[PDB]
Ligand binder design. Sequence first.
Ligand SMILES: COc1ncc(N2CCOCC2)cc1S(=O)(=O)Nc1ccnc(-c2ccc(CN3CCN(C(C)C)CC3)cc2F)c1
Length: 859
Amino acid sequence: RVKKLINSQISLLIGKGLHEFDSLRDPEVNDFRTKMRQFCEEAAAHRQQLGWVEWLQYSFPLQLEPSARGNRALLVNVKFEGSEESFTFQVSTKDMPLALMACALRKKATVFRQPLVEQPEEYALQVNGRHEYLYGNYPLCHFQYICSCLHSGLTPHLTMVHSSSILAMRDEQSNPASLWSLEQPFSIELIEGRKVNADERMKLVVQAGLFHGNEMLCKTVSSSEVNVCSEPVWKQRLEFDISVCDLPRMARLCFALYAVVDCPIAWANLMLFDYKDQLKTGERCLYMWPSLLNPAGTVRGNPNTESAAALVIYLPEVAPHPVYFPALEKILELGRHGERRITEEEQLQLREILERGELYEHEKDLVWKMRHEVQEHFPEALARLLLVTKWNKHEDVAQMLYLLCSWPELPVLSALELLDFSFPDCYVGSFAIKSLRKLTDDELFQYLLQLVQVLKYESYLDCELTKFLLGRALANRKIGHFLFWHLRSEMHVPSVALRFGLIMEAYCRGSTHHMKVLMKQGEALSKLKALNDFVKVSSQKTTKPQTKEMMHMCMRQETYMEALSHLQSPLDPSTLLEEVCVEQCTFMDSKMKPLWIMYSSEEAGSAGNVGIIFKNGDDLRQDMLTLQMIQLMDVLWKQEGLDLRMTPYGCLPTGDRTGLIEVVLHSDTIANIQLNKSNMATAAFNKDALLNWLKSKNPGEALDRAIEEFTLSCAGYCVATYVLGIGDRHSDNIMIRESGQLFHIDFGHFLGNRERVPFILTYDFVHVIQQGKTNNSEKFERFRGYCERAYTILRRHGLLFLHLFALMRAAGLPELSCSKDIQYLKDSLALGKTEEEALKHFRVKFNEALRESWKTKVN
Ligand SMILES: COc1ncc(N2CCOCC2)cc1S(=O)(=O)Nc1ccnc(-c2ccc(CN3CCN(C(C)C)CC3)cc2F)c1
């Protein structure tokens, strides 16, 4: 009764009926579902018995300041859960939550004239009207919430929540109750093709290659030219220059059907061994993807069989019995035997190339020969060694694996490199995952987007990365929340819909309660899509105030009021979207008419006043990636004591060309501010407009802080947009907060898009930095130091950006497709240079931007 209901809820939530999984009659799919359902149910059972503080860590993970990861007076308002009464008292930013709780309990004991049985140790502090809590031994300023309150001048509002109330939360959210002997050359039979569409004047060719990730295992082989028709017949043997015994475990056979007089038509790939390590034999009908060879492409066929071109091949029965890939112990027994001492002049050449990339043929022979010295004295150079390993020789792969199986754990930075498609071996991926287990939940969340993209490179459904991601998502509700949405937003992509659908179902088995919370979000998103469609049509016939009044009426319907109210925000599960403020809702006049949905919450006070933007028609993945990169910059800067007052607002794709963007309230575009309308708080010179607007928002002594906020954030965005190559910057996509913080929006073009984006300096912004003065080198040169400091901090982490962007090539974003896009980051970060050379080059670029800025000052 309940299992049937849950299955129907999973189907609606993931956007694909579970019956469709069953209908594939696919053993691999069935074994994934069984194994992962069991793995996720164990996680759920472990969670239901967690202690009350451990359950707060699961459900409300701490939001700490980046500097606090791994003195001053403060007013705080504290209430108790079943109370309207509140106590405002002064604490120190260095006090711990326990002291604040003990203080609140003394105030409650004297007001209620009774000495209390409850100890401060029995409570946690909830941020009012948010799924956010303050707990643990950390000073108040170490929490992101208190730190945020400190800068914005607002008073923290906290609610004392008792352990029994937290346990009541935990309880109501419960789940219900031998190859190496086969020396023959590898070969296949190209039988025939189906549903082929091509120019009848041309001829058809099938090119085939053997790959181990990016590297070709042997030379490619082509079929003979056969006349173009819908059902081509070849019925010919294709033989490769590699012995069957040497095919590595992760070998893939890649096809490309094209037309010749070049006209690409289709591609299809497959793993030579199955998920149970057995070499494949018999016929295979390969349903091809429309387009020369595509090795990174998926190894599962095109699901649109009704119209996909197919390629029938035959994998020969190389043995009278099934052949399985050797078990690890047999590989290790073979690799155990090898040879290790060569010249100090050869040793010195190894230290130069390992601390240097690309290298010559003789240097590969030197790195391979000294592989034991690589393991012992340069363990972090494992990736260079794996690249020199000849993956087409089964005995060199066995020696690489013997060293790998005793390789010391590498740092997270090194592991993120190893997840790249250039390291397709399963043991290498397993080693990379083992070195990633030490990632904190905060580091994991920072890199989650890249780890999800790595799933598209996985050759098999059940893998160490999926289990690692599912285990982390079930142990942290915020990780779980975003893993769900990163997968859900790609269900319209046929190449990932099965893998992603299966991960989402398995996660759902682990948290029935969270599945229901996510349904409530999908219901709101469903209604927002209908509302945006209504707005796009109505905006073409009537005026903006009429379409807005019609939008409000459609929102005031009972179905909309229920669907859109009392939900956790997809942008941030800590943010509660309570009462939709229909009157404050609106839409932008851009082509897709994005909706601006406003919310309030009595419980949360001013912090419950939040906005979300529903956007349908544009792809939001590039915006999300850019905004995550700016947030990563902000974390790296704050880790060095540098706060550039950045505004990395939320952006989350949720569906096909659909997603949400977090509203930053009290913000306006530079264009609106520069409109210089009359009867407002009105410049003599348009250059005075931003500064006058800052003055009206920050009177008296507050102007100085607003100018400083502007300066810091301007330096941060100047460096961020330059490093990332964000172009097409104009007054309509640069915003300013009433606090003075400048920020950028609308990141549809990055990494040059394809020119080399120069460093930018705007006169109107220089004018604010210079406090409205023509000459103010004191304030201007403080700003130049903020820029150089920010830039030099990012260069020190250049490899982190490079590794993350390399993992993102799997996303298929058009402006991040090849090594040419990664080159842009190398050039902007000047990674081939020393710090002095790169600082000299940054100074030349900043000075160039100043002379260009002066072409406006001169006018
Ligand atoms: C990529 O899209 C976005 N990215 C970030 C934001 N961000 C918007 C700000 O928060 C961060 C995200 C918003 C959008 S969008 O989808 O709304 N598209 C664009 C495009 C150009 N310009 C804008 C704009 C134009 C004018 C204004 C000025 N505000 C004044 C205050 N009202 C309220 C009182 C209703 C709204 C208009 C803002 C714009 F964004 C909005």
